[PDB]
Every structure is written in C-alpha cells, then in structure tokens.
Amino acid sequence: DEFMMLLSKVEKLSEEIMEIMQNLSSIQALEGSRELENLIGIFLKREMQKTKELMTKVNKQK
Amino acid sequence: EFIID
Amino acid sequence: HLESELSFLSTLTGINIRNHSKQTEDLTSTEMTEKSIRKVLQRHRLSGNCHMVTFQLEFQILEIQNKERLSSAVTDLNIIMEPTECSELSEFVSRAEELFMFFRSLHFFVEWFEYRKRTFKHLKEKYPDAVYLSEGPSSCSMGIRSASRPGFELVIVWRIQIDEDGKVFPKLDLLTKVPQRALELDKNRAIETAPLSFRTLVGLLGIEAALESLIKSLCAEENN
Amino acid sequence: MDETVAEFIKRTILKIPMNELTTILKAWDFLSENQLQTVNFRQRKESVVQHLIHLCEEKRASISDAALLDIIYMQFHQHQKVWDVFQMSKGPGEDVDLFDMKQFKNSFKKILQRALKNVTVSFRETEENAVWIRIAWGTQYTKPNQYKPTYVVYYSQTPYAFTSSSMLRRNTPLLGQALTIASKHHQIVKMDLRSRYLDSLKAIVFKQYNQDSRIIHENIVEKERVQRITQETFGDYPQPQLEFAQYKLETKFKEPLRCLIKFSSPHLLEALKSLAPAGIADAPLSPLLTCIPNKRMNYFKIRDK
Amino acid sequence: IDKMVETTELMTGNIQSLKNKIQILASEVEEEEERKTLKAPTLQKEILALQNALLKDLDILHNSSQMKSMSTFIEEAYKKLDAS
Amino acid sequence: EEKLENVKAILQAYHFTGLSGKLTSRGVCVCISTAFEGNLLDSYFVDLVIQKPLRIHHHSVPVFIPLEEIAAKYLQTNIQHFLFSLCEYLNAYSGRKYQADRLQSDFAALLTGPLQRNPLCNLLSFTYKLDPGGQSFPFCARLLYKDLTATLPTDVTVTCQGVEVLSTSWEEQRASHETLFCTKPLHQVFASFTRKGEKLDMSLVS
Amino acid sequence: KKRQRMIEVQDELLRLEPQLKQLQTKYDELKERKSSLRNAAYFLSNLKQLYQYDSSSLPALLFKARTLLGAESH
Amino acid sequence: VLRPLDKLPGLNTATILLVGTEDALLQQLADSMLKEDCASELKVHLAKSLPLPSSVNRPRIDLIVFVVNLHSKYSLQNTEESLRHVDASFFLGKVCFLATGAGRESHCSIHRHTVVKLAHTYQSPLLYCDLEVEGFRATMAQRLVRVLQICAGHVPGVSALNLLSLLR
C-alpha cells in the first residue's frame, strides 16, 4: 500500500534520516537543555524497525 | 392561602 | 446497582473505572508503639480508559487512625499512564507522594484533549489545502500556505501546560516561522507582532473560531 | 459596677435556670477559675445573683461584656424571641475576600453608631462560624435600651443573617442597612422565614437539614400510597418550624376572599407529615405546606396561578 | 454621605453617558469586526521570544524537512489510522 | 465476583475520586471527599435531584464555611448544565476551602494571638511570632486569597506589628515570609519555620 | 434626619453597587472594544496586508520528530 | 355497592367491616375485637370509605360498623358519603353505627342527636363508645363481636333481621 511503501520508505528513512540526523551535530544541542527539555514542548534504528515490523503488520490487519 | 402570603 | 455506578462514572467523569482491585496490607503491629495511634496500609489498583487516553493506578495509602480521629494520608503512589501527556503530570505523581487532584487535572486534561482533537478534526477536515497539520496525538502543528505572495507559511502551536496545582493552563502560542522564500517581501511589522497579536485574536472569537478565522484570513487569502 | 450595667447583669442572671449557671458563666470569662469557688452555686437564687454581681463589682463590669453575658444566655435560649432571617445579595463580581472579624466588628459598629449613635453593639464570634451580634437599641436622645435588645446571628460569610424579631422598629431597616454594609453585600432582604427555633432556621436556610392476619385493611393499597407520598414530600426528620406559618388569602372561592391561615404547632413540619397518614390530609399533601423548608420561607409573597 | 452619593452620581452619570458614547464606539468596533481563556495565559508570550544557532538549525531543518517528508508524513498517517 | 469486583469501585471511588456519588434514586448524592496534598480529613455531602430543571436538593457543602455553600448556589450560576464540569469546580472549591481549613488546624503555639481567620480561611490573619535572634517584633500575616480555587494564598501581607523598618535582617525576614507563604503552604512552612527558628524563641513586646 | 440618613445610605449602597457594576462594565468594554479592533482589525488586516522567531519551526520539528518515537511506543 | 349475601359465608368465619375515616381508632378497635379468644374466626376488615375498591375474594361481610367520630365532621360527612354505597338489605341487621369520641362532649363537632338521627333514619343500631380509651374499647369490642355472631348466624336462634328488632 501507499502507507506500506511510505513505511518501507520510513524504513529507508530509518537508515537515511537517522544517518542524516547523526551527521547534523548542530541538532544535537536540542533535547539537551533545561529550557528546551521543559519549555520547548518537553539510537532508534531498532525502534524504527519496531515502527516497521509492528506497524506494517498492524496496518495490513486494519 | 393559595400561597398568597 | 453496578450498572448505575457505570452510568455515574459516565456522567460524573472521574474517567472510566474498569480494572479495580482492593487489597489491604494490615500494619497495626506492635512496632509502631501499639499503645499509640493506629494505622493500616491499603493498596488498590485502578486502571481505566478515557475517550482515548488510558491509565493504570498503583495506589497504597497509609490510613493513620489516631485514638480520636482517622488522619487518612498517602505513602505510596505510582502512576503508569501516557508519555508526554503526563510528563508534566509526573510532577504531581511525585507531589502526591511528597492524589485527589489527579482526578481534577486529568479530569480537565481530558476536556483539554477533547477541545484539542475535535477542534483539529474540525479545522483540517472542513478545509485542508493551505492547511497542513502535523497530525499526531501530541503534535499540535498546522501548516499554512498563501500564494498571493508566493512564499508564505505559518504554524500555530496548541501547547499544553498543566501547573503543579492541577489547573490546566492553555498555552495558545503562535510559534511562527515563514520560509526564506518570501521572508523579506511584505516588509511590514505584521509578522514581528504576530505571536503577541495571536493572544488578542483568540479573545475576539471562540478559541476554535479564532483559529478558523485565522485560517480563513491568512491561508484562505488565496481561496478568497 | 455602673448604672444599667450591674443592674442589667443582675436582671440577666436570674433569667437562666439553676442548672446552667456554670455553663453560661464560664463563657464570658469575667469569673476566672479562682472566682468560681467563691460563689456557692447550689444554695439559692437570690444568694447567687447577689454574690455573682459582687464578683463583677470587684471586676468593674462594663456594658461591653454585660451584653456579652446576655449573648451567651441567648445562645442557650435561642428558642425564644422568634428570629427573622435576612438574606444578603451581592451583585456581579468576586466574593468578599476580606471579611475580617476585626473589620466586620468595626464596619458594623461604625455604620450603626453613625445614625444610632447611642447603642451598645457587642459581637461574640461563635465556634460554628456565626457572628452572634447583639444590639441594644436607642435613639440619640435616649441611652441604649438593654431591656429589649435585637440579637443578630450573622453567619460569617453567608448572605443570611438571622435577626431576633423583638420590636421591628425604625431600626430594622437600619439593622439590615449596617448588616449589608459591614458584610460587603449590596441588598438586604427579609426572606420571610420567621421561626422561633434558630437551630431550625439555620438548617432550613442553608439546606443542612437532610444532608394481624385477621385484620384485613381494605384500603391497604391506599394507605401504602398515603405513606409513599408522605415519605416523598417529607423525606426524613422534618425540622421543627414551631412558627405561625401565615397564609393570607386573596383567592376567589371556587371578587376574592381573604383569610390569614396560621398553622400553630410545637413541631409544624412533623405535624403536617403526620396529617395524611392520620386521615386529616390527602395523600398528595399540597405543595402549599410541604415546600416550607424547600422554599426556605414560610411567610410567602406570591400570587394566584 | 450626600457628597459621597453626589460624587457617585457624577460618576454614574459620567458613566451612563460615557458608556453610551463607547457603546456607539463598541458598535463601531463590531463594524470593524464586520468585514480565563487569555487571562491565565497572559504571561505565556515571553516564551515565544526565548544567530549561529538559528541559522544552523534552519539549515538543519531544511534537511530535516526532507526527513519530515517521510517521518512527519508517517506520523500524520499513523495517527490518522489511530484517529480513524 | 461481580458483586465484589464492581461494587468495590464505589469503595475505590470513596478513597480516590473525590466525587463518588451515592446511587440514591431521585438525585445522585455526590459524596465529595477532599484532600490537601496527600492527607484527607473531611467529606462533603451534596444532595441533588435528577431534574431537567437542575436543582440541588439539600447540600452539606459546608455552610459554616459557606462560600462553598454560596458556590453551591452561585457556581451553578456559572456552570451547572454539565455536572461534568460542576463536579470539578465544586470539588475544586471544596478541595481548596478545606486546604485552608486544614492550613488552620496546624496552628498550636508558634503563634501568640488568636488565629483570627475567615470561613474557608479566605483571610487567615494570625499574629504569630517567629523571632530568630530575640529582638521581638511580631508579624501579623493577613493571608488574602483572591481565588477560592488555588490552594496557596494569593495576596500575602506579613505586616510588622505597628513598628518601623528595622535592620535589614527583619526586612529580609518579611520578604522571605511573603515568598514562602505565597508559594508554599503553612502546613509545609510553619513546620519549616520552627525547624529553622529552633528552640521556639518567643517575644517580649507581644 | 436619621431616617433620611438610612435612605441616603440605602441610595449610597445602591449607588455603590451600581457604580461597581458600571465600572466593571467600563473596564471590560474598554479592554474589549478599544484593544480588540486595534489588535484584531489591525492584525487580521495586517495579516491580510501580509499574506494578500527563527527557532520556532526548529522547536516544532523537534516536537514532531519526538512524536515519531512517541507514536511508535503507542 | 356492597351486598350482605353476595358471597357465601365461611365455616366459623364472622368477618366484620369497620368503616371510619380515622384508622388509628379502627386499628385499636380491631385489636380489641380479637384480643379475646372467641369461638368464631373473626376476620375484621378496616376501611375509610365504603366504595371499598373492588377486590374479589373478599369474604361475605357479616357486619359493617360505621365508626362515626363525633369529634370530626369529616367522619360523618364521609359516613353519609359511604352510606350511599350500601344495600337496603344490608341496613337490616348487619349495620351498626359506632359513635366514638362521644361522652367527652367538648370536642364534638357533631351533636350526638345528628348521629342518632343518622342511625335512626337508616334503621340500624347505634352503639356509643369512646375508642381512644382501651377500657371502653375492650367492653365495646366484645359488643361488636356478640353483634357479629348474631348477624353472621353463629348464634343459632337470632338472625341479623332479628337483631334490629331487639336494638330498636
């Protein structure tokens, strides 16, 4: 399906975007500040794999 | 009274 | 009578009380100077579901029963609930252990979530072209796009803030950024005053009505 | 030890019965624990009223607590001098965030001595959060008349302030006047509850009152219904009105017809409850009497419909 | 007391006439509108105000926008399934 | 099992919801029990009738401290069409108006004069004596609550008892009392003031 | 004069209540009418004047990126 | 409308029917009617108005005692409002007129002539008593049973018809 293809793309994004996010060291400053972890709206390849193995199987069953 | 006072 | 209790839980919304189990760890032994005040430490599990949000309760209260009064209190409280939604309430899951007011904050936190979700499903479903919405359980981020000037975009963020007192504080922010395509095209002070004037905008119409009117007069400027 | 002060104390001491000498005299604190042993309370009446008045002769008694003694006397005898009930009403806005007892005792005395310059106003804040005012009235031409005072039980933050209906003089529009100015309200309204039992008025106004095999009774299905409607209009423990619940007609006999129906019972709402089961009353006993506490007022003022 | 209520009557007359003239003004405000919701949050505007960081984040956000093309869309789709 | 696994919820609602309603026919009786922070020592019995003309039957929403009772007659002038919201805003009034009532029962002897309070303890005006050093000049603290919902006081007036500006130590003490009363309750402050002001040093002028 | 004093205070109590309500209305109407249009009719037209703060979208994107893991855990 | 002989009698059952507005005195009179252990199964019936809601299986009423409280004019006006639901064959023997409250004579909203005129214009016995006192109930209740055994036919010499010829 389109969502499953997007999920496959998300799985591709899991390899891509996480690598893109790992390369961007400037964004590492986020979620590492007392004024960001509280005021700014308060290793995920396996989690994104759980967002692919437990989501593509679950989306199809819907 | 019819509840008049 | 339990059917009427479910009905009462449906109208007097302490949220659904589904999985309840009352045990009691009797602690009236002699270690506590049995001549003095009595006590008992009951423990209750109270799991339940809202319209969408769930919760589970680990609840162990010390019941100090003095020789003339029953100074009921709490010693242990563990809350297993939603993630970001109760991260702010995680302050109270320790304040209640440092209890009733979790059934008044989350009692109105769920009303806040209703006024969030149903208003979002109003604004996006009724009209969603110039409007993109970061559709998530906690992502209150709407896209805006007007093409009269070809490079405009706005986002309103429907932030949630619950204080330590359990009072819900609706943080109605306009967390603005236009892309660099047309940042310097209007050249007016309309954008610099945008997030301060948003607090005025919500006070004019209904809170949802103000968002709908901002949509109709900011990204529907191409539609109108 | 003064004029109309020692005599007033003497006149208010013998009023109380022999049993409650200690209970009343411990409250007003003129007699410290040492002074109580000097007077022997158990011999006679005129002996105790003479040695007790001497104990304040040496204490130099003043009207300020001489009226207070009458206050504690009335707190144990509130079932006399039938009480009015006034109802305050603020406009639109926030509550009275500053009802200081000091400020209220000041803002009542100031407004009451502004016009009734010769009065002895004496407050005694009771433990049930009900300021028990007592006002000895008298115009500027005369001394304050302590013979017949007008006790006012203003419940501290409540809009309602019960008032002893003693004479209903030209001061009763000023009694409410200073009551609605001291307490930061705007309007005074006698809600028309006029009962002698103050502890029964307090429940009514605040809604704190309910919070053989051979004998075959042929009309058993009717007696059960009579009991049902009696138990659905008088739920449990009806409070004692004990007041002339007036009913002044203006009704055409089915142009108008006037009478002034006055129910007079030692316990009114428990007498009406025992009317329908006794056959004196119909089973659906008229709202006309059952909604005496539900209306929080027994001298009504509405018309035909 | 009469001076007090005379000052109060000057004030109330000032106000009936002045709120009549600003109720004309208020109709003007509605005609311009033609064509504790905020009191509690009256101090939350300071967080909006709170550079090298801005430029680096914006440049990263442009790359993160490409990431958001697959991530936010998946989130907008997963929650849509959750909402439905 | 259902007679115990679905009836103990009422018992569970007693200890926890603060809004457990007795299932009395003709009007649910919401037995509102209230707690300050983690301690609870009162319950308020509001009696209603199930009528589309929404009338409260005979409340026990305390009439001795009766702004709740006025709120039993005036909060419905704001919202009553939803018992959903009334049960909250009335449990809020009862849960704060007991908190200040519970912020009263603590006072034992740290204070010298009588705790001249208010019903709901809207105005807690107590002439206490915290004297860290011996130079005696007490503070009469008129704790003024703008709102009957927030547990903590809103307007703190820790006024020196008819005395001029003393040395910087006592002005510092007054400024600290203001910010410790506005943010932290007396139940958690006057137990931290005896702890800091050890030995219970009373006064000489008062 | 004392009866006249009671009547004047009754007027003074009524005058005080009426003046308090009138001043409350005055402040509410001043705020609403004067500031709403000077802010709404300004901004709504200024937004129209626009259409027809640099870390804000960065924070929104960080929240959206955390929302991915939040929904994955859901 | 009640009839004396619509239902068959029991076996030893003599079932009276007391008719009076006040039911406290009726209940006391019924308690006194069964306090003595008589030889007849007395099934006393109470009532307020003879209309008597139509319930089948009701026994053959062998006696109706119109307890007329002389203190209250309601107990009379309801009695004449209950006498218009009686048979002309019921007033012969099986009808008595109890007049309670009489003798006190200071609370009587009804003159005792009016009740005697009422009981003489229906040609039925009028038995005076005072139901508020037990000492005058237990001696009058035993009079309503010896009348009841007469009308029910338990004394095998005297009919209900023979009774009013003796109480005239």
What 3 state SS string does D284-305 have?
Answer: CCCHHHHCCCCCCCCCCCCCCC
- The candidate with the shortest Cα–Cα distance to C190, out of G52, D25, A60, G2, is G52
**Secondary-structure breakdown of chain G: helix, strand, coil percentages, each rounded to the nearest 5:** 90, 0, 10
d(CA D172, CA D112): 11
- The candidate with the shortest Cα–Cα distance to C176, out of E30, D242, G51, is G51
| DSSP structure string for F58-126 | S--S-SSSTHHHHHHHHTTTT--S-HHHHHHHHHHHHHHHTHHHHHHHT-SSSB-S--B--GGGSEEEE
Chain C: give the shortest CA distance to residue A10, in Å: 16
What amino acid is encoded at D263 in this protein? F
Per-residue CA distances from E59 to B4, C132, E67 (Å)? 82, 21, 13
d(CA H16, CA H47): 11
The two three-digit tokens of residue D52, written as one number: 């007790």
Q: For residues E33 and G40, is the Cβ–Cβ distance under 8 A?
A: yes
- The candidate with the shortest Cα–Cα distance to F202, out of F114, F136, F141, F140, is F136
In a domain, residue H33? The reply is: yes
The two three-digit tokens of residue F44, written as one number: 């308020």
Select from H17, H23, H52 the Cβ nearest to the Cβ of D279.
H23
In a domain, residue H7? The reply is: no
Strand pairing report for F40-47 and C54-62: unpaired
d(CA G61, CA G55): 10
Chain E: give the shortest CA distance to residue C198, in Å: 10
Chain B: give the shortest CA distance to residue D251, in Å: 7
Q: For residues D149 and D137, is the Cβ–Cβ distance under 8 A?
A: yes
| Alpha-carbon torsion angle D170, D171, D172, D174, nearest 10 | 110
d(CA H131, CA H125): 17
Chain A residue with Cα closest to E68: A17
Residue recorded with tokens 């605040």: D206
In a domain, residue H90? The reply is: yes
E58 vs A: CB within 8 A: no
Chain C: give the shortest CA distance to residue E6, in Å: 37
**C136: Cβ contacts below 8 Å, ≥ 6 apart:** E75, E76, E79, G64, G67, G70, G71
Length of chain F: 206
Contact D209 F57 (CB under 8 A): no
- The candidate with the shortest Cα–Cα distance to C214, out of C138, C140, C130, is C130
Read off the DSSP letter of residue D187.
Answer: E
Contact A55 G59 (CB under 8 A): no
What amino acid is encoded at A14 in this protein? S
**C6: Cβ contacts below 8 Å, ≥ 6 apart:** none
Q: For residues C125 and G54, is the Cβ–Cβ distance under 8 A?
A: no
What amino acid is encoded at C100 in this protein? F
In a domain, residue H76? The reply is: yes
Residue recorded with tokens 């703190």: F156
- The candidate with the shortest Cα–Cα distance to D103, out of D123, D74, D87, is D123
d(CA E42, CA F2): 50
- The candidate with the shortest Cα–Cα distance to A21, out of H120, D213, E71, is E71
- The candidate with the shortest Cα–Cα distance to G74, out of A10, C16, C52, is C52
C170 vs E: CB within 8 A: yes
- The candidate with the shortest Cα–Cα distance to D279, out of H64, H141, H102, H19, is H19
Best residue of D85, D101, D207, D292 to probe chain F, by most F CBs closer than 10 Å: D207
Three-state SS string over chain G comes to: CHHHHHHHHHHHHHHHHHHHHHHHHHHHHHHHHHHHHHHHHHHHHHHHHHHCCCCCHHHHHHHHHHHHHHHHHC
- Paired with D152 in beta bridges are D133, D163
**D287: Cβ contacts below 8 Å, ≥ 6 apart:** none
**F176: Cβ contacts below 8 Å, ≥ 6 apart:** none
d(CA C80, CA C47): 9
Length of chain E: 84
**Secondary-structure breakdown of chain B: helix, strand, coil percentages, each rounded to the nearest 5:** 0, 0, 100
Q: Which residues of G touch C177 (CB under 8 A)?
A: 53-54, 56-58, 60
The two three-digit tokens of residue A13, written as one number: 């994004």
- The candidate with the shortest Cα–Cα distance to C153, out of C161, C141, C145, is C145
Read off the DSSP letter of residue D257.
Answer: B
D186 vs G: CB within 8 A: yes
d(CA F159, CA D278): 66
E75 vs A: CB within 8 A: no
The region that residue C46 occupies, defined by phi over 0 for left and psi between -120 and 50 for alpha, beta otherwise, is beta
E43 vs A: CB within 8 A: no
- Paired with F44 in beta bridges are F32
Contact C155 G39 (CB under 8 A): no
**H165: Cβ contacts below 8 Å, ≥ 6 apart:** none
The two three-digit tokens of residue F125, written as one number: 């005006």
Helix (H) / strand (E) containing D200: helix D198-206
Q: Which 1-40 residues of chain A touch chain C by CB within 8 A?
A: none
Task: Report how many domains make up chain H.
Answer: 1
Chain H neighbours, 3+ Cβ pairs < 8 A = D
Contact B4 D299 (CB under 8 A): no
> What is the greatest pairwise CA distance in chain F?
71
| Alpha-carbon torsion angle C98, C99, C100, C106, nearest 10 | 120
Contact C165 F38 (CB under 8 A): no
Residue recorded with tokens 């967390």: C175
In a domain, residue H97? The reply is: yes
The two three-digit tokens of residue G69, written as one number: 């893991």
Q: What CATH number is associated with residue H155? A: 3.40.50.300
In a domain, residue H36? The reply is: yes
3-class secondary structure, H134: helix
Method of determination is: cryo-EM
Q: For residues F117 and F65, is the Cβ–Cβ distance under 8 A?
A: no
Strands of D204-295, DSSP E? 216-217, 245-248, 260-263
d(CA D13, CA D45): 9
d(CA C70, CA C64): 6
For residue H167, count CB atoms less than 10 angstroms from its CB and return exposed for 0-12, middle for 13-18, buried for 19 or more: middle
3-class secondary structure, B5: coil
Q: For residues C58 and C77, is the Cβ–Cβ distance under 8 A?
A: yes
Per-residue CA distances from D182 to C42, C48, D98, D103, D110 (Å)? 49, 50, 11, 8, 9
In a domain, residue H82? The reply is: yes
Strands of chain C, DSSP E? 19-25, 41-49, 54-62, 76-80, 157-162, 168-173
For residue H82, count CB atoms less than 10 angstroms from its CB and return exposed for 0-12, middle for 13-18, buried for 19 or more: buried
Residue recorded with tokens 């929904």: G71
Q: For residues D79 and D154, is the Cβ–Cβ distance under 8 A?
A: no
Contact E57 G41 (CB under 8 A): no
CA G60 to chain centre: 26
The two three-digit tokens of residue D305, written as one number: 């419909």
3-class secondary structure, H51: coil
Residue recorded with tokens 């007696």: D223
Q: For residues C152 and C178, is the Cβ–Cβ distance under 8 A?
A: yes
Q: For residues F145 and F163, is the Cβ–Cβ distance under 8 A?
A: no
- The candidate with the shortest Cα–Cα distance to C219, out of C125, C134, C155, C126, is C155
- Phi, psi (5° rounding) for residue F159? -90, 135
Chain B residue with Cα closest to D248: B5
The region that residue D138 occupies, defined by phi over 0 for left and psi between -120 and 50 for alpha, beta otherwise, is left
Chain B neighbours, 3+ Cβ pairs < 8 A = D
Chain C: give the shortest CA distance to residue E44, in Å: 7
The two three-digit tokens of residue D178, written as one number: 């200073």
Q: Which residues of D touch B2 (CB under 8 A)?
A: 249, 251, 288, 304
Residue C30: Cβ within 10 Å count: 7
Residue recorded with tokens 């995680």: C90
Per-residue CA distances from H43 to G3, H39, H60 (Å)? 75, 13, 10
Q: Is the dihedral of CA D44, D50, D51, D56 positive or negative?
A: positive
Q: For residues H98 and H67, is the Cβ–Cβ distance under 8 A?
A: yes
Range of the domain at H101: 13-167
d(CA C139, CA C31): 52
Total CB pairs under 8 A between chain B and D: 36
- The candidate with the shortest Cα–Cα distance to C116, out of C82, C86, C141, C88, is C141
Residues just before a chain gap in chain H (C–N exceeding 2.5 Å) are none
3-class secondary structure, H16: strand
Q: For residues H3 and H89, is the Cβ–Cβ distance under 8 A?
A: yes
**Secondary-structure breakdown of chain A: helix, strand, coil percentages, each rounded to the nearest 5:** 70, 0, 30
F27 vs C: CB within 8 A: no
**D179: Cβ contacts below 8 Å, ≥ 6 apart:** D86, D88, D108, D152, D154, D161, D185, D188
d(CA E79, CA G71): 7
Contact G69 A44 (CB under 8 A): yes
The region that residue C183 occupies, defined by phi over 0 for left and psi between -120 and 50 for alpha, beta otherwise, is alpha
3-class secondary structure, C159: strand
Length of chain G: 74
Q: For residues F119 and D129, is the Cβ–Cβ distance under 8 A?
A: yes
D168 vs F: CB within 8 A: no
Three-state SS string over C19-77 comes to: EEEEEEECCCCHHHCCCCCECCEEEEEEEEECCCCEEEEEEEEEECECCCCCCECCCEE
Read off the DSSP letter of residue C185.
Answer: S
Per-residue CA distances from G16 to E7, G3, G20, G22, G27 (Å)? 11, 19, 6, 10, 16
Contact D217 H45 (CB under 8 A): yes
3-class secondary structure, E75: helix
- Paired with E79 in beta bridges are none
CA C137 to chain centre: 11
Chain B residue with Cα closest to D287: B3
In a domain, residue H1? The reply is: no
Helix (H) / strand (E) containing F42: strand F40-47
Count the alpha carbons within 13 Å of A5 in the hemisphere toward its beta carbon.
2
User: Can you state the angle between helices D172-182 and G2-29, rounded to 10 degrees?
Assistant: 30
Strand pairing report for D160-164 and D187-190: unpaired
Residue recorded with tokens 């016009």: D115
Residues just before a chain gap in chain D (C–N exceeding 2.5 Å) are 211, 254
Helix (H) / strand (E) containing H116: helix H112-121
Contact A41 C88 (CB under 8 A): no
Angle subtended at Cα D139 by Cα D136 and Cα D143, rounded to the nearest 5 degrees: 60
d(CA C47, CA D34): 63
Chain D residue with Cα closest to G25: D92
Q: For residues H163 and H151, is the Cβ–Cβ distance under 8 A?
A: yes
Q: Which residues of F touch C99 (CB under 8 A)?
A: 16, 35, 38
Chain E neighbours, 3+ Cβ pairs < 8 A = A, C, G
d(CA C112, CA C114): 5
Per-residue CA distances from D131 to D34, D126, D179, H91 (Å)? 29, 6, 11, 70
Contact G17 D186 (CB under 8 A): yes
The region that residue C153 occupies, defined by phi over 0 for left and psi between -120 and 50 for alpha, beta otherwise, is beta
d(CA D123, CA A12): 82
d(CA C153, CA A22): 28
| DSSP structure string for E5-59 | HHHHHHHHHHHHHHHHHHHHHHHHHHHHH---TTTTTTTTTHHHH--HHHHHHHH
CA D43 to chain centre: 33
Contact C73 F39 (CB under 8 A): yes
